[PDB]
Write a protein that binds this ligand. Structure first.
Ligand code: HEM
Ligand code: HEM
Ligand code: HEM
Ligand code: HEM
Lengths: 146, 141, 141, 146
């Protein structure tokens, strides 16, 4: 991924303030609420009948912590997203059968969650930097589809 | 959105398709799987190889639904209501993929309808498929 | 497509926005120009520097239209008839850009509405913006 | 841009039979008919009110041949589309103000036109090769946007 020194510092500085468990649970929850077709992979998680049921589902929170943890690790390798996520890409294509459009949806929900979480500190230039990063991550997760 | 001329255009073109509708539906799916490999994520339980009876079978149901949509162009929400339910609540296909299949159906018709696929008919068919796509995703949320 | 509870959610949240709607409209544009630079291709005649009167002016007109839509949520096609005409016949903005502005308006609302931007209200707001976008592009062809 | 030997041989063989003049005119004209908002960049071209006006318009035919000629030369540099189109990219951004979504639309119309012209010879694998190419050319044209 190609970001300027300014963009990278802005991403890293904000991320230091993020509770990865809390934010990951929130972002996955909102994905399944706002775009409910994304629930198709998670029937084994149990009760997704209402927004509160989604947001309070412990299996949703658990998965959310797991994927944002991998994301979080990605931020340390902004210069090699493709290589960092190569094996996850294969896994999502070949075994999980996840349409990569879902990664783009999650990216946009994540940006909304950060804005909600950080309010005025999530300035337009900081948003712009995170938009590059989530498109970068979605592209890297989609890279090995065939 | 569908003008009287669009409606006339679609019936004329689809009339021309006739008994081939199923064949063309299968070809459209195959074009889609090869051109846009991500769409294959929705069919992990299929044999997608060329000539696959599962693909031929699905192509026929697709074509049949389109035939029903053309015959009910003025009341498409009702005629495709159960198909709208099925896609929204069970299959849950991301709406972006509908534009990819629509394009592939357009290419298939172009390749088989030399005389009939004029600029005017092309535009009407593209509008028709967008309308069908809209109906099929109308209950997603 | 917008359920009765969606309408209630949107009305409550836009109510909260209140007199800040113009400010928020200008901010959403600024976010769009920065995050999605291709959207600047539609404003080569504007000074797009931060705080520009043209941007602030356009922000207010943006907010006014959305206020109109929220006030006539049960009759948006007729409420936004003129604006639908203007985008289809004159401005002719590619439909993909409406999703980008919608995303930036959501981010703006999230950043300003901590208490109100719950998962359900987020979903209702996203649906609302798609509906507005659908209406504004409904006469394109 | 990378293709398989099969994809590259498919692309170059069919392209040898294409009359850039005739095809370029048809592709631009169908773009203007099927997606009439694209007419916003051609106000000085005159009569675009009806399909038959658009398709018989001499400036459309002329402009068609010009852009498919540039497209054509790009087919000779498939390994470096970004480098090939850099200058034209900057032009389309800074002087012409063309939303790069238009490049993708033209891509898909061009594929429809090849299918219309070549019929059964435009097989699903040949289409797949061309879809890759038109996406690569579109991305190459959008690369210097800022
Ligand atoms: C940036 C976003 C994402 C990242 C980094 C990510 C990462 C991961 C990780 C680390 C795993 C575990 C792999 C293993 O067990 O070896 C996983 C599993 C999985 N992911 Fe993704 N993922 C992302 C997006 C998504 C999205 C949006 C969906 C679908 C809506 C999804 C669906 C799944 C599924 C279904 C599993 C398996 C669940 C299980 O077996 O418990 N992923 N993901
Ligand atoms: C013009 C749009 C579409 C039409 C008319 C359509 C219609 C249909 C029909 C008639 C069925 C079969 C229902 C039955 O079994 O009774 C079906 C099933 C299905 N559709 Fe759609 N479809 C459309 C688009 C799509 C797209 C874009 C995708 C995915 C890329 C998709 C994925 C599926 C899947 C996964 C099945 C189930 C196949 C099986 O296992 O039998 N559909 N569709
Ligand atoms: C929620 C979607 C939108 C709404 C409610 C909206 C509404 C408006 C309004 C109220 C006007 C001014 C009308 C007048 O005073 O005559 C306007 C103008 C304009 N809009 Fe839209 N707009 C939307 C999305 C977009 C998008 C996505 C773009 C471009 C990326 C865009 C580009 C323009 C342009 C170029 C102008 C003219 C500005 C000027 O020169 O004054 N609009 N819009
Ligand atoms: C494969 C994609 C394309 C290529 C290779 C291409 C190439 C070119 C070239 C070589 C020129 C001529 C410049 C000159 O002679 O000075 C040009 C100009 C232009 N192009 Fe593009 N083009 C493409 C797509 C498009 C599309 C889709 C649009 C907009 C719908 C567009 C709109 C224009 C405009 C407005 C001009 C200037 C016309 C004039 O001088 O009056 N281009 N293009």
């Amino acid at each position: 991924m190609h970001l300027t020194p300014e963009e990278k510092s802005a991403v890293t500085a904000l991320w230091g303030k993020v509770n990865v468990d809390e934010v990951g649970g929130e972002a996955l929850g909102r994905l399944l609420v706002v775009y409910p077709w994304t629930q198709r992979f998670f029937e084994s998680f149990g009760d997704l009948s209402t927004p509160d049921a989604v947001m309070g589902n412990p299996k949703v929170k658990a998965h959310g912590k797991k994927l944002l943890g991998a994301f979080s690790d990605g931020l340390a390798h902004l210069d090699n997203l493709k290589g960092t996520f190569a094996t996850l890409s294969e896994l999502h294509c070949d075994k999980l059968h996840v349409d990569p459009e879902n990664f783009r949806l999650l990216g946009n929900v994540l940006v909304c969650v950060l804005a909600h979480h950080f309010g005025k500190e999530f300035t337009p230039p900081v948003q712009a930097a995170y938009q590059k990063v989530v498109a970068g991550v979605a592209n890297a997760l989609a890279h090995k589809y065939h | 959105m569908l003008s009287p001329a669009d409606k006339t255009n679609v019936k004329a073109a689809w009339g021309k398709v006739g008994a081939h509708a199923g064949e063309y539906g299968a070809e459209a799916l195959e074009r889609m799987f090869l051109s846009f490999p991500t769409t294959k994520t929705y069919f992990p339980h299929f044999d997608l190889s060329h000539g696959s009876a599962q693909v031929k079978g699905h192509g026929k149901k697709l074509a049949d639904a389109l035939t029903n949509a053309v015959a009910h162009v003025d009341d498409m929400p009702n005629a495709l209501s159960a198909l709208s339910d099925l896609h929204a609540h069970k299959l849950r296909v991301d709406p972006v993929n509908f534009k990819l299949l629509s394009h592939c159906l357009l290419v298939t018709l172009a390749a088989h309808l030399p005389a009939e696929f004029t600029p005017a008919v092309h535009a009407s068919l593209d509008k028709f498929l967008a309308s069908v796509s809209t109906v099929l995703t109308s209950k997603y949320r």
